[PDB]
């Protein structure tokens, strides 16, 4: 939904809970990260990453 | 005379005059809101949308931003508004 893509499309006075929920999701959903593994003395076997 | 004064009080309890005198009222919303008021029916839903910027949209298109049945006598779709004639 475009409103989910951009929460500003939801009027606060008309749909307060939904607007807050979207902003909550967009603000608190965790950020992915990465880390190494294995040993450089061996092949990697990774395809994309 | 009683209802007129009471309706003024509601309109001024929200939207203090000194911050809103320049704004333009939507005639459609105003008519519906006033009509419900003296029909002894709550009008809170309308007060949120009493104004509109005439340089940016029409009194119709300003309403079609909220395409759903506002109340039993005021139904607005994505392109149209239905209401009994006064």
Give the orientation angle of helix B27-38 with respect to helix B2-13, to 10 degrees.
120
DSSP A8: G
Interface of B with A in 24-83 (CB under 8 A): 48, 65-66
Cβ–Cβ contact A13 with B under 8 A: yes
- For residue B16, the tally of other CB atoms under 10 A from its CB is 9
Technique behind the model: cryo-EM
Cβ–Cβ contact A11 with B under 8 A: yes
Asked if residues B66 and B76 have their Cβ atoms less than 8 Å apart, the reply is: yes
Resolution in A: 3.3
Exposure string over A8-40, b if 16+ CB within 10 A, otherwise e: eebeeeeeeeebeebeeeeeeeeeeeeeeeeee
Identify the three-state secondary structure at position B71. strand
């Amino acid at each position: 939904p475009p409103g989910f893509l951009n929460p500003q499309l939801i009027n606060p006075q008309q749909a307060p809970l939904l607007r807050a929920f979207a902003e909550h999701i967009r603000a608190n959903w965790p950020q992915p990260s990465e880390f190494g593994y294995g040993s450089t003395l061996q092949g990697s076997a990774n395809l994309f990453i | 005379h009683d209802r007129a004064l009471a309706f003024v009080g509601v309109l001024t309890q929200r939207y203090p005059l000194t911050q809103n005198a320049q704004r333009y009222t939507n005639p459609l919303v105003l008519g519906a809101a006033f009509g419900d008021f003296l029909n002894a029916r709550s009008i809170d839903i309308f007060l949120d949308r009493l104004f509109y910027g005439p340089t940016q949209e029409s009194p119709i298109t300003s309403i079609t931003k909220f395409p759903y049945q506002w109340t039993i006598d005021f139904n607005v779709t994505a392109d149209s508004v239905r209401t009994p004639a006064g």
